[PDB]
Amino acid sequence: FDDWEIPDGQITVGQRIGSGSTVYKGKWHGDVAVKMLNVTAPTPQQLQAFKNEVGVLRKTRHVNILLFMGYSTKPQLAIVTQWCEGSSLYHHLHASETKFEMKKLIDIARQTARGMDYLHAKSIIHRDLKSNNIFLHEDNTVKIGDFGLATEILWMAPEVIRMNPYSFQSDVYAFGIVLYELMTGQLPYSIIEMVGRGSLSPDLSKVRSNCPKRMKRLMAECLKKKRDERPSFPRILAEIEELARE
Amino acid sequence: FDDWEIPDGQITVGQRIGSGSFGTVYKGKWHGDVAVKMLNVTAPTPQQLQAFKNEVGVLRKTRHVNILLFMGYSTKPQLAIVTQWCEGSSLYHHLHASETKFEMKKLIDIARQTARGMDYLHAKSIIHRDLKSNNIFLHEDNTVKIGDFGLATEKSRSILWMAPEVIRMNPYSFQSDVYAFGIVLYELMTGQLPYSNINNRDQIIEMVGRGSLSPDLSKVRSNCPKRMKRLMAECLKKKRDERPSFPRILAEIEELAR
Numbered sequence: 001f002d003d004w005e006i007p008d009g010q011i012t013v014g015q016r017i018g019s020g021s022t023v024y025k026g027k028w029h030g031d032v033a034v035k036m037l038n039v040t041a042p043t044p045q046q047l048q049a050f051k052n053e054v055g056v057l058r059k060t061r062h063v064n065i066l067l068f069m070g071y072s073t074k075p076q077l078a079i080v081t082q083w084c085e086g087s088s089l090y091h092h093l094h095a096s097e098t099k100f101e102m103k104k105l106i107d108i109a110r111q112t113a114r115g116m117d118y119l120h121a122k123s124i125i126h127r128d129l130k131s132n133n134i135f136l137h138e139d140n141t142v143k144i145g146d147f148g149l150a151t152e153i154l155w156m157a158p159e160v161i162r163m164n165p166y167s168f169q170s171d172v173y174a175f176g177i178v179l180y181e182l183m184t185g186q187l188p189y190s191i192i193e194m195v196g197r198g199s200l201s202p203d204l205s206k207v208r209s210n211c212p213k214r215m216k217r218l219m220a221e222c223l224k225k226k227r228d229e230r231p232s233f234p235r236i237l238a239e240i241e242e243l244a245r246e
Numbered sequence: 247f248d249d250w251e252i253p254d255g256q257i258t259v260g261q262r263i264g265s266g267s268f269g270t271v272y273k274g275k276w277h278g279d280v281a282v283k284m285l286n287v288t289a290p291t292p293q294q295l296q297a298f299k300n301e302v303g304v305l306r307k308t309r310h311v312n313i314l315l316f317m318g319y320s321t322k323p324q325l326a327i328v329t330q331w332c333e334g335s336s337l338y339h340h341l342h343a344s345e346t347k348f349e350m351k352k353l354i355d356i357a358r359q360t361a362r363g364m365d366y367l368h369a370k371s372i373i374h375r376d377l378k379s380n381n382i383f384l385h386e387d388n389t390v391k392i393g394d395f396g397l398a399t400e401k402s403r404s405i406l407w408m409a410p411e412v413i414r415m416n417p418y419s420f421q422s423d424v425y426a427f428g429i430v431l432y433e434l435m436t437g438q439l440p441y442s443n444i445n446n447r448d449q450i451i452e453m454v455g456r457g458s459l460s461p462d463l464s465k466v467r468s469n470c471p472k473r474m475k476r477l478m479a480e481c482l483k484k485k486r487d488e489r490p491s492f493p494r495i496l497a498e499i500e501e502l503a504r
């Protein structure tokens with residue numbers, strides 16, 4: 001707690017970047033990102049829950065997840081992480097329209113899976129995984145974010161729509177959707193009633209022609225309508241590592 | 247300009263930033279961060295190349311802290327211009343997208359640095375023609391840098407920033423640059439663009455062009471100092487001959503700031 005607190009005198013909040021689970025670029029012993037949560041003058045109960053989550057993030061460390069640097073309470077709850085100069089995967093794919101070579105697509109998927117596997121090995125469900133939460137850092141690594149505050153549509157699993165209902169398996173389906181994004185350059189269904197009941201699912205015929213057959217199949221496994229039929233991240237990750245070498 | 251050429255083997259073109267004046271802007275690497283503007287030209291004819299080289303000729307001799315530092319050019323695979331990177335994006339993005347709220351003193355500072363940049367360009371016989379918030383950049387070090395002033399003679403041979411005589415036609419001049427600067431001041435002091443309520447282009451053109459419609463000065467901040475508002479109005483005069491020059495604009499600002 002205390003040792004991770006970044007008093008508001010120590011940090012310069014800069015340009016507003018956008019919204020997630022509200023994000024600014026900032027300064028604190030170098031560049032950072034600061035997420036301002038929608039809370040000021042927290043009640044003791046909110047403060048407590050917040051301290052609990054910061055308790056989890058404190059102990060998370062992996063090259064493929066956003067590095068946690070500290071939190072603030074005044075004037076607003078906030079979370080500070082390292083800055084990712086390469087914007088988000090969502091921005092790269094659907095806005096600036098960057099076209100990565102298939103090697104790079106496979107690489108991004110792999111790094112994402114490494115971070116997700118790590119989170120899950122740490123008993124952290126993401127619940128919100130999407131191309132918007134996948135940031136590209138200057139060193140060319142990929143960092144998953146927005147996994148904080150655990151205990152507190154295009155990427156949603158059918159069971160998560162037709163209400164837990166969240167689970168590790170629903171995370172896996174989100175990752176399937178990200179794979180779809182990577183291999184079609186598009187978002188799916190480009191509704192709730194139809195995906196929830198399993199008569200509508202992402203159109204896999206759309207995927208790139210040079211997408212390796214094992215990637216396409218893994219995407220399909222991750223996107224299965226009944227969650228028990230989805231592969232865990234340990235197996236997802238091994239399968240990606242095998243095919244990337246093959 | 248052999249010495250200013252940057253062959254494609256020396257630059258790593260990165261993420262697309264957007265479409266500025268004359269071309270498309272990417273972030274890149276060349277002995278550090280750079281911006282590269284890719285012009286809409288590949289396989290230039292000898293005449294395009296020559297025109298482009300003359301322009302590089304001007305750019306290589308320009309140097310002022312309130313204008314993008316020219317770093318060099320490429321001819322292949324496509325014509326390109328390379329300049330220093332501005333980590334703070336554009337004035338336009340700050341005021342209108344991320345709705346950053348500057349204190350009045352920074353607003354005045356931004357107006358001032360821009361004036362210093364514009365004054366510099368004009369002292370250099372360079373007409374901007376495209377001055378707007380979209381091409382006024384905020385550097386990491388908190389300086390402002392004007393861009394898109396490259397290629398003057400090629401433009402020679404955005405309606406919201408356009409002086410009347412430019413709309414109702416080459417009617418470009420130093421004075422129309424001045425009118426543009428006035429629109430930036432309007433943006434700075436009102437936090438908004440002019441004619442915001444008017445969802446129709448050809449309306450703005452016809453009326454502004456004829457002198458019956460002009461930016462609404464009643465919308466400017468309470469805390470905006472009288473001389474700044476006055477200067478803003480002098481800059482926006484419909485008759486180009488009644489606009490001050492940048493030497494006068496800059497001195498007026500230097501003076502009201504103190």
Ligand SMILES: CCCS(=O)(=O)Nc1ccc(F)c(C(=O)c2c[nH]c3ncc(-c4ccc(OC)cc4)cc23)c1F
Pocket residue numbers: 017018020023024032033034035057066067068079080081082083084085087088091133135144145146147148149
């Ligand atoms: C340990 C993680 C805690 S968390 O689960 O709560 N996630 C978290 C916390 C705080 C943040 F600020 C962010 C966050 O969004 C970014 C962080 N570092 C970035 N670096 C760069 C861009 C970014 C630039 C430009 C963009 O273009 C629109 C998009 C994204 C975003 C971030 C975040 F994900």
Ligand SMILES: CCCS(=O)(=O)Nc1ccc(F)c(C(=O)c2c[nH]c3ncc(-c4ccc(OC)cc4)cc23)c1F
Pocket residue numbers: 263264266271272280281282283305314315316317327328329330331332333334335336339381383392393394395396397
């Ligand atoms: C010597 C001047 C020659 S010129 O007349 O041709 N101008 C010129 C040349 C080449 C360029 F790349 C640019 C140019 O646009 C930027 C330059 N350095 C930037 N640094 C940062 C953002 C920028 C980030 C993020 C944004 O967020 C949307 C917006 C703008 C743009 C530039 C430019 F103005």
Ligand SMILES: C[N+](C)(C)C
Pocket residue numbers: 057058059060061062067068069
């Ligand atoms: C402990 N941590 C620095 C890895 C977040």
Ligand SMILES: C[N+](C)(C)C
Pocket residue numbers: 305306307308309315316317
């Ligand atoms: C010489 N310089 C124009 C690049 C500054």
